[PDB]
Amino acid sequence: GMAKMRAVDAAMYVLEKEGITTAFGVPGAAINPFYSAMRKHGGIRHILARHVEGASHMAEGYTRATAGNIGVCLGTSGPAGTDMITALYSASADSIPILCITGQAPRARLHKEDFQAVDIEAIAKPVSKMAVTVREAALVPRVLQQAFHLMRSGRPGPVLVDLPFDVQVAEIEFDPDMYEPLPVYKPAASRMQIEKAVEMLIQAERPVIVAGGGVINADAAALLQQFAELTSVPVIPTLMGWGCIPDDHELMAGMVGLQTAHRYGNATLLASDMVFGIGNRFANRHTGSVEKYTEGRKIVHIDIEPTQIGRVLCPDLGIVSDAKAALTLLVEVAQEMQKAGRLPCRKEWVADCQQRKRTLLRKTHFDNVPVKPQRVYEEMNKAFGRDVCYVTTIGLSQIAAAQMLHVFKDRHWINCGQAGPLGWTIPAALGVCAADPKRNVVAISGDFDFQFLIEELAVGAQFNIPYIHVLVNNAYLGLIRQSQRAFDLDYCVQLAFENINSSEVNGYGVDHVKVAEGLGCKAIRVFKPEDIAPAFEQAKALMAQYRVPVVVEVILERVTNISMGSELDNVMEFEDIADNAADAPTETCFMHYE
Amino acid sequence: GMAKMRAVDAAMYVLEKEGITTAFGVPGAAINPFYSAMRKHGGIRHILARHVEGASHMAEGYTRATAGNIGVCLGTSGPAGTDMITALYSASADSIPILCITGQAPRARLHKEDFQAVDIEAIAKPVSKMAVTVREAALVPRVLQQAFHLMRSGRPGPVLVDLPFDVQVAEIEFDPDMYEPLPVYKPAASRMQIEKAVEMLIQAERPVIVAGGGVINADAAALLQQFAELTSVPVIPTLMGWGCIPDDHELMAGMVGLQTAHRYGNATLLASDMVFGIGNRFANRHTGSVEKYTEGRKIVHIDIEPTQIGRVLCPDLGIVSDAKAALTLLVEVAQEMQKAGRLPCRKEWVADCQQRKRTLLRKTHFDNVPVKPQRVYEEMNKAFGRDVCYVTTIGLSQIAAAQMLHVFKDRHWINCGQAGPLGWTIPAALGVCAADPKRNVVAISGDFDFQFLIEELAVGAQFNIPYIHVLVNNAYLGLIRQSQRAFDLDYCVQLAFENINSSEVNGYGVDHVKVAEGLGCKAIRVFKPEDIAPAFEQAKALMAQYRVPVVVEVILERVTNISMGSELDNVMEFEDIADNAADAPTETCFMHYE
Amino acid sequence: GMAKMRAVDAAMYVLEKEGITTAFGVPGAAINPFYSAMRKHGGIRHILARHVEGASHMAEGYTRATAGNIGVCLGTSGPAGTDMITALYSASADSIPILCITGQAPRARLHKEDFQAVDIEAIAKPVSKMAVTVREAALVPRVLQQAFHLMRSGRPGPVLVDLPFDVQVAEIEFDPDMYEPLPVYKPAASRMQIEKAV
Ligand SMILES: Cc1cc2nc3c(=O)[nH]c(=O)nc-3n(C[C@H](O)[C@H](O)[C@H](O)COP(=O)(O)OP(=O)(O)OC[C@H]3O[C@@H](n4cnc5c(N)ncnc54)[C@H](O)[C@@H]3O)c2cc1C
Ligand SMILES: Cc1cc2nc3c(=O)[nH]c(=O)nc-3n(C[C@H](O)[C@H](O)[C@H](O)COP(=O)(O)OP(=O)(O)OC[C@H]3O[C@@H](n4cnc5c(N)ncnc54)[C@H](O)[C@@H]3O)c2cc1C
Ligand SMILES: Cc1ncc(C[n+]2csc(CCOP(=O)(O)OP(=O)(O)O)c2C)c(N)n1
Ligand SMILES: Cc1ncc(C[n+]2csc(CCOP(=O)(O)OP(=O)(O)O)c2C)c(N)n1
Ligand SMILES: COC1=C(OC)C(=O)C(C)=CC1=O
Ligand SMILES: COC1=C(OC)C(=O)C(C)=CC1=O
Ligand SMILES: COC1=C(OC)C(=O)C(C)=CC1=O
Ligand SMILES: COC1=C(OC)C(=O)C(C)=CC1=O
Ligand SMILES: [Mg+2]
Ligand SMILES: [Mg+2]
Ligand SMILES: [Mg+2]
Hints:
Chain C: Catalyzes the condensation of two molecules of glyoxylate to give 2-hydroxy-3-oxopropanoate (also termed tartronate semialdehyde). Chain C: One of its GO terms (cellular component) is acetolactate synthase complex. The first copy, chain A, is of the alpha/beta class. Helices cover about 35% and strands about 15% of the residues of chain A. In chain A, the strands form five sheets. In chain A, strands 3-2-4-5-7-6 form a six-stranded parallel beta sheet, with helices on both faces. In chain A, strands 16-15-17-18-20-19 form a six-stranded parallel beta sheet, with helices on both faces. The first copy, chain A, has a five-stranded parallel beta sheet with strand order 10-9-11-12-13, sandwiched between helices. In chain A, strand 2, helix 2 (about 30-40) and strand 3 form a beta-alpha-beta unit. The complex binds flavin-adenine dinucleotide (2 copies), thiamine diphosphate (TPP) (2 copies), 2,3-dimethoxy-5-methyl-1,4-benzoquinone (UQ0) (4 copies) and magnesium ion (3 copies). One thiamine diphosphate sits at the interface of chains A and B. One flavin-adenine dinucleotide (FAD) binds near residues 95, 212 and 257 of chain A.
């Protein structure tokens, strides 16, 4: 029961009671007392990163992998905290928590210029739900207790806790048996709200549901699918909702937007007369101009956060609610409407949507040498099972991947959709694997994203954390080259050079096979499209055998312009489109996934 | 003359007028208009980094290399700006400027949640002299004009300028012929202040001058040496002042502090009766407890910043002045005192200081296998000339290097002394080489620092930027292991693993020779101490021949405890001390440098 | 000559050398050592206001009346400082200075919800050229020295100096004879610019 212990020893009991079992970090002198309490306590597996930014993105992958997870990132004072800002931003931006814990100079020296003392509280305030320097040892458990309440309540977001060295080692009296987590705050829609939304849905003749990341945040994917099935309403997931209904479900109508979107998804949205938004916001790369997106359409918006409703467009009906509470009530009311015979039949509209999904395609089956990126994603759909979990960040690599890969379960598309920090992909994939060693994790990176935090591969080697990383190498910042077309420029975006140790890379610059092997991983380079599928089969074998990351590097043609535009009705198709299965053989309409 | 142009085109003329010739950056869509103006203008050499943090630390190395330089760092919106915070902190902390320029979402969408729009102004405020989002196109030249005034005036520091996309492309009328840089503000000591300081100096019987980074910031090293020679007063440089008098000068008395310090330097400070501080602050790792540092000693402090005087200890005389203005007047007054016969002879005190410098040594000449790190620094002193320019960050690698290497000119020790961010070393060295292609740049890293931003070696390969990187590999976070001794811990600080591709690294983990070669550089691994000197000779040849970075990796014994303590009178000597040249052959007392 | 004195006594020598002769204020327990120093030093005429906002606007009128004047407004901790925000905004907005000086709780109690302790630094930062809590007794003369430089230089504006009670009464060594005001920064047009204008 009650005993005298250091404030960091009390912190270990609090973290255990709050369900923490994993931490990613880089120790230093100012955070040593915390590491010493973590060693004495046991039960937290620490993973040593090779950049503080790597540890903070591992914590994001850990959070995102499984409902209820909270990745923890640990660092010393000074530059460690400033190295966490990008991850706090990325987590805030996507409404997901991580808990960052930093050491700090002792309280008496905070306004002197103590070595590596920085005002991290002020720096981190705009990208966190709370950033606090703990000023008394007895407050360490209470700040953590409040932090966990904030990370789970309302619109979720990250917390930074900053621990002065003297506060960490100071004694307190603490009773772990008496510690209890605070209740989680979640507003719930009333029946009056939900019945109005269902009445509006029944009146629409061509409705779609836009299912957002809030549905996944609330762990409500099964209810979302059930509500769509009862009402027979096609579902458009946002990039952050992708997976909340399986991609081969007959009501999955494709994705919408300026870049990570399908031709059939955009055409279905523009033909619709109502958008029933659940757990989405209306992101600008999803909508284009809001005036065109809302034209001729009633808009419903359900969001847990009141000030998200009406922020970018005015809904006809806005409801403040947790998505699981809302969907529980939407299923009940839809079942009552079904018994009363008041849900309309929707066979024509569902048939029109499916017809678009069957004909408005993009070619993937390219035999070209050098390889076309879209062929890589066709081979990934064939090589990996239905349970594949993709991790990716940003680039033409990521945009085309979102256009052409398929996913079948929530939290099998792990992607930092609002902030898109380069280098996120490797640490996030390691964090997903740490959350779930049985997960079939496959990452996708372009060469530039792969280089930012390339040293994190050695974390996977040191700790034996296996996953497959697909690296598509054009020796370009490919997305920036494409955006420079508007300026008739191709300027400062090339990565190629004659590698003085590897004439076999043929002027592509970095030799990723050599780099990955020096970092302790396995790697395979692919030049010809028919060698992609065997390489994915070797990579699985190498992974079972050595239990380390395996990189499959595909050498691409230097320049491919991926389809994108500035409005839903203006997406330009640069590469070949398709209307038949032979050019696009891995659409779910044509291919059984597992 | 006057013409209509985009606001970014006016920015190019302003940057040219302000002396900018180099920029380090990573383009993205939101900053493309600026890149397009930089391409159209010419005359700025852009260097593409492989992490935005790498570009920001290259800008720091560029600033630090040469008086008057201002490194420029360019990035897109969102995570690029959050990736610059660590460099802004490091530059603020050391009183040096960089100019960071970020793209931003258009003004009308700043409070919507536009893709990658972040409140970078608020995040960067605590680590910059100005952080501003430019709200009108006509203000772009005026914000830059104010930015350059701030970066050069008072206590120097960094500026972040954030450019909304629509502000960048909007037209203005601008006349480059009429643009003029603002005057620089620098307070100057009066004769009444300086005469009082010289009177106090004359009364002291055992004075020392502590020469800080402010002397180098003011470009006043030659005056500092001249003032010490006229008054015959021994000089103790801080780590940030190191080089402002040559290490073989008869008045150079060694360095002082808890870690990067000499036994003779600390013993000389504790024996002194006055500290004449010029351009220093009194950093806690330099002083220890201020009560012990000031005991029995009058303190003079000259600083350009009024609120630095009395911040950590109360001087007997505090003077607000630029160090060059102060030293100009100190030389004149000392010459007047010399003509009047009022400067005391100081032969005994100078002789006592030199006697300490000759006898209070640390052993470097170790024949051990595996290699002892202190032998590496002895070989570096022999292999490189007097004009060597060292670049380093933090770790036992850096602390012992500061204890045992010698430097002979200002700005030949490039080191982020207050913030110490891991990964700084490679990008900073590339930035120094970009500032001065004739500089003989040698970097020092431990293995963990080397890994953080290891991909930046490919920047040196792509752009042919040659320098030598000494990598001392203990497969440990060695400084943290040593600080964990106080907790009877060795926990989460080891980097070793059995590399499945390289049994020759013998369980040390990452194979840096393979990684460096995959990144396009040359590399040499050294296991035996007698092979260090030949490896430095091969590295010079490889560098002349291939014009890329050359890494020399020395395999160290796993555990070496470097001398350090918590007070000047308590520094513990773990490894062998020396009182003879044979154990410490590269002290300047024993060895002629060039 | 150099002498031992309280930080507030050294502040009195600084205000004298910077030309202060008048102050408007409302005393309180947290600013009493400063009032005790003003009484002992003499040479500043104090006008007692009947609202802290009244003292802050008297300081504005005193500044605005005559070139080179700097009105000084004095108050205690807590609501006195919040009583001053409107004048700080009015002074900033018109590019003119006032010097506001507030008492504050002792440093050891600044995060402990001590009676009438408020984060006036953060509240006043948007409406001042500088707003600072002085953390060391030796810094009191230096903060005032930087304040007068900022109030006169560039675009002029007001400054708020917040004084913890333990900082005010701590002894320091200060030599009034050695104090000198900082140079004022004012940029000047070149002849090239003026000929173009004409
Ligand atoms: C290069 C690139 C291209 C992209 N292209 C596209 C594209 O074409 N189309 C596209 O759609 N996206 C695209 N994205 C992603 C896009 O930027 C956004 O991240 C995404 O559209 C946002 O999805 P969302 O509306 O579900 O929002 P989210 O960020 O997932 O959040 C939606 C809402 O959920 C709420 N919420 C949180 N928890 C709960 C809960 N328990 N219950 C209810 N509500 C809750 C939050 O308050 C928030 O308002 C792209 C990203 C990149 C990097
Ligand atoms: C692991 C590690 C160990 C270290 N160990 C030691 C150690 O043992 N000893 C040690 O001394 N340092 C040590 N350092 C470095 C230390 O932390 C500080 O960076 C350093 O001591 C500060 O030097 P300085 O006083 O010259 O200050 P600086 O940071 O260089 O600044 C001094 C002052 O210069 C002023 N200034 C700027 N421009 C001008 C100008 N034109 N004219 C006049 N003034 C100007 C600024 O206002 C500032 O107050 C260590 C660093 C690390 C990372
Ligand atoms: C820190 C950061 N800097 C810049 C960007 C802008 N950016 C987005 S994609 C991209 C290029 C990515 O290239 P690569 O990963 O090789 O992919 P490709 O587009 O060539 O497939 C850049 C620079 C960013 N998202 N984050
Ligand atoms: C971003 C960041 N995280 C953590 C630290 C704390 N830190 C200082 S030195 C060090 C270990 C450095 O190890 P290495 O570079 O191998 O050098 P060694 O001490 O072993 O010679 C760490 C983690 C830091 N300075 N910066
Ligand atoms: C894309 O890489 C780059 C070069 O090499 C092609 C250059 O010559 C210059 C000036 C910039 C650049 O980014
Ligand atoms: C018959 O199963 C199929 C569908 O569901 C009806 C579809 O929507 C599409 C597009 C193809 C298909 O085979
Ligand atoms: C130093 O590397 C580390 C390990 O391997 C030795 C571990 O087993 C654990 C639990 C933490 C760690 O940091
Ligand atoms: C004779 O030259 C020499 C000195 O200067 C007098 C010294 O201070 C020391 C320590 C050695 C030396 O050789
Ligand atoms: Mg890296
Ligand atoms: Mg690429
Ligand atoms: Mg090491």
